[PDB]
Design a protein around this ligand. Structure first.
Ligand SMILES: *[C@@H]1O[C@H](CO[C@@H]2O[C@@H](C)[C@@H](O)[C@@H](O)[C@@H]2O)[C@@H](O[C@@H]2O[C@H](CO)[C@@H](O)[C@H](O)[C@H]2NC(C)=O)[C@H](O)[C@H]1NC(C)=O
Ligand SMILES: *[C@@H]1O[C@H](CO[C@@H]2O[C@@H](C)[C@@H](O)[C@@H](O)[C@@H]2O)[C@@H](O[C@@H]2O[C@H](CO)[C@@H](O)[C@H](O)[C@H]2NC(C)=O)[C@H](O)[C@H]1NC(C)=O
Ligand SMILES: CCCC[N@H+](C)[C@@H](Cc1c[nH]c2ccccc12)C[N@H+](C)CCC1CCCCCC1
Ligand SMILES: *[C@@H]1O[C@H](CO[C@@H]2O[C@@H](C)[C@@H](O)[C@@H](O)[C@@H]2O)[C@@H](O)[C@H](O)[C@H]1NC(C)=O
Ligand SMILES: *[C@@H]1O[C@H](CO)[C@@H](O)[C@H](O)[C@H]1NC(C)=O
Ligand SMILES: *[C@@H]1O[C@H](CO)[C@@H](O)[C@H](O)[C@H]1NC(C)=O
Ligand SMILES: *[C@@H]1O[C@H](CO)[C@@H](O)[C@H](O)[C@H]1NC(C)=O
Length: 526
């Protein structure tokens, strides 16, 4: 129950899972807490300790704003931090199978949340099922989000940007140096993450400092080329100083703005994060990844285009209704408590909310490409069109474009299309297969029969868990034993992808082809 790490001993705890045992090490620190003079700076090496660190409970989440739009609603509150917020939050978790494995493949989870929210202690990121069922080791880490993790004064070590990504990177290196003692194989490490976590995984594929820290990569509903994933150096500067004046720390010695921002309390920085953008959207990433010249040496679309990334296998995918969740966060006529039938005029109003800095012509171009119906009667159109608009633009086609360009350099790629709405989904049915609701199936929560899932959901998750594990172990996301559909490699010519659902697992081609050609070629010009 005790493991000796390179900086000290850690005590874990035993968990009963599916008539077996999983050993959990919740809340191991991997960096010196970024407090006081270290706020906004890269994570620092952790001083060795002499006692037994008790890693028997999730540690603090990093400071962050909370989704308060539906108090008491499990559909939104399940994503809010389930542990204390604090700047002392650079910790990680380890689930190892019992008995202790000998050279187990390691899965490292990076949570999403728009680079402003999220925590690894969430119930749907519980790594005990993966450890139990597939005998892999699951690692997850907390990393700073929001301005505390991504405030950027480019070149300035007081606030260089991408600190949260560097938290992630330091956690990966912790796995490199320590996971063998847990029975993990440091040479068989697969990163996986969702949304901003997935975009973070994609940026680790491009960051040279991360190329030796992992083997393979899984990208769930996200990639760096998504329009929300990377902040310009222009916007970054304009935004760190908008925060400065909003907190009354505007100076000319740029270093002196940071020391002044370092004395304001976390909540004051949190409450001003929202107003630093002129017109926000429900997908606004006020403080995100930037081209810092350290973690990210160039603009990532160029690195992707010119083949500058770790050459390895990727597993990429999206859900059928990526965009619906965001429409009840500002789009008029929408609500989780009715079926949100909206007019043409409300649809047009919705575009101005999701594309506020977009010209009149650009917004008409979106309307034109998405509102030439197969059929004019049906009242659900403008409602579903707006969801497809936000979904295709923000997630699906950035992911497809990332997979096309990555695969063009000779690596095996696998694309999935998750289209099962969970039986336990608390959101209304018109939102469909929502953003983030493939995660519970990936972590194998439907495998616990005591948690209200249908047996078809247990079987789908069990296959997904096997495919994910086989990809991590072997670079190939097949289920070989139960006469399952083979998952074909995604090539840029034919673009085959695999659909994931309870009934029919089928091979299709060229997902959302007509929609993405608009989004990836025409729309970036407007
Ligand atoms: C860059 O930032 C300026 C300043 O932002 C304003 O001040 C901040 C403290 C915060 O309160 C923001 O909400 C403010 O917008 C932006 O300039 C403002 O632009 C909007 C309209 O576009 C409007 O509030 C004011 O006319 C402007 N204020 C000033 C002082 O110029 C600017 O739009 C941002 N973006 C760019 C590209 O410059
Ligand atoms: C779906 O509901 C929204 C509003 O939700 C509820 O209704 C409000 C009266 C209020 O009690 C909220 O707290 C509820 O959650 C409807 O949008 C409203 O539509 C009318 C139009 O005149 C008006 O109340 C507001 O302008 C709208 N509010 C908005 C856009 O936020 C919407 O019409 C409903 N749709 C259907 C099909 O029932
Ligand atoms: C006030 C602080 C919390 C605000 N949220 C957590 C934001 C997070 C976020 C910002 N930018 C992003 C880009 C891409 C993906 C996510 C984000 C925006 N949404 C309000 C997410 C809320 C919904 C997300 C979808 C999953 C389930 C339904 C819930
Ligand atoms: C670390 O934990 C030691 C053992 O704690 C054991 O496990 C926990 C979950 C409780 O059930 C406790 O009663 C058990 O004995 C402690 O003896 C030790 O004091 C702890 N040290 C610190 C610094 O917390
Ligand atoms: C684990 O596997 C790697 C290769 O994947 C090998 O180099 C290493 O020696 C193995 N460690 C063991 C078996 O303890
Ligand atoms: C203010 O001056 C320069 C930047 O102009 C900087 O090097 C210096 O460190 C700043 N002052 C302090 C006390 O850091
Ligand atoms: C294959 O089917 C058996 C039952 O025939 C089931 O117990 C097992 O979990 C399945 N394996 C996978 C990987 O789905």
């Amino acid at each position: 129950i005790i493991i000796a790490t390179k900086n000290g001993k850690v005590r874990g705890m035993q968990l009963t899972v599916f008539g077996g045992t999983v050993t959990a090490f919740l809340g191991i620190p991997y960096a010196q807490p970024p407090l006081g003079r270290l706020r906004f700076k890269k994570p620092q090496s952790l001083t060795k300790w002499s006692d037994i660190w008790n890693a028997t409970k999730y540690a603090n989440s990093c400071c962050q704003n909370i989704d308060q739009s539906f108090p008491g609603f499990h559909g939104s509150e399940m994503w809010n931090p389930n542990t204390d917020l604090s700047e002392d939050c650079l910790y990680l978790n380890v689930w190892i199978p019992a008995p202790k494995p000998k050279n187990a493949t390691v899965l490292i989870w990076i949570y999403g949340g728009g680079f402003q929210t999220g925590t690894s202690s969430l119930h749907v990121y519980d790594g005990k099922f993966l450890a139990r069922v597939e005998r892999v080791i699951v690692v997850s880490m907390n990393y700073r989000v929001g301005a505390l993790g991504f405030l950027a004064l480019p070149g300035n070590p007081e606030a260089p940007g991408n600190m949260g990504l560097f938290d992630q990177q330091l956690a990966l290196q912790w796995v490199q140096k320590n996971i063998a003692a847990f029975g993990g194989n440091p040479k068989s490490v697969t990163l996986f993450g969702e949304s901003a976590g997935a975009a973070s995984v994609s940026l680790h594929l491009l960051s040279p400092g991360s190329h030796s820290l992992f083997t393979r990569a899984i990208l769930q509903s996200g990639s760096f080329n998504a329009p929300w994933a990377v902040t310009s150096l222009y916007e970054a500067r304009n935004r760190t100083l908008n925060l400065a004046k909003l907190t009354g720390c505007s100076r000319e010695n740029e270093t002196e703005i940071i020391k002044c921002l370092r004395n304001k309390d976390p909540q004051e920085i949190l409450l001003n994060e929202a107003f630093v953008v002129p017109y926000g959207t429900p997908l606004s990433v006020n403080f995100g990844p930037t081209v810092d010249g350290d973690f990210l040496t160039d603009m990532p679309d160029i690195l992707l285009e010119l083949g500058q990334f770790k050459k390895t296998q990727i597993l990429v995918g999206v859900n059928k209704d990526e965009g619906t969740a965001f429409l009840v966060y500002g789009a008029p006529g929408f609500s989780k408590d009715n079926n949100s039938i909206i007019t043409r005029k409300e649809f047009q109003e919705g575009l101005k909310i999701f594309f506020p800095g977009v010209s009149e012509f650009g917004k008409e171009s979106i309307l034109f490409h998405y509102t030439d119906w197969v059929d004019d009667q049906r009242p659900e159109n403008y409602r579903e069109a707006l969801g497809d608009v936000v979904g295709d633009y923000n997630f699906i086609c950035p992911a497809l474009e990332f997979t096309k360009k990555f695969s063009e350099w000779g690596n095996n790629a696998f694309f999935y299309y998750f289209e099962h709405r969970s039986s336990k989904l608390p959101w209304p049915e018109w939102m469909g297969v929502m953003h983030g609701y493939e995660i519970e199936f990936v972590f194998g929560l439907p495998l616990e029969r005591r948690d209200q899932y249908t047996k078809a959901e247990e079987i789908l998750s069990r296959s997904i868990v096997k495919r994910w594990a086989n990809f991590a172990k072997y670079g190939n996301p097949q289920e070989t034993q139960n006469q399952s559909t083979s998952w074909p490699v995604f090539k840029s010519t034919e673009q085959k992808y695999l659909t994931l659902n309870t009934e029919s697992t089928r091979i299709m081609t060229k997902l959302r082809a007509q929609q993405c050609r608009f989004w990836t070629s025409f729309f970036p010009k407007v």
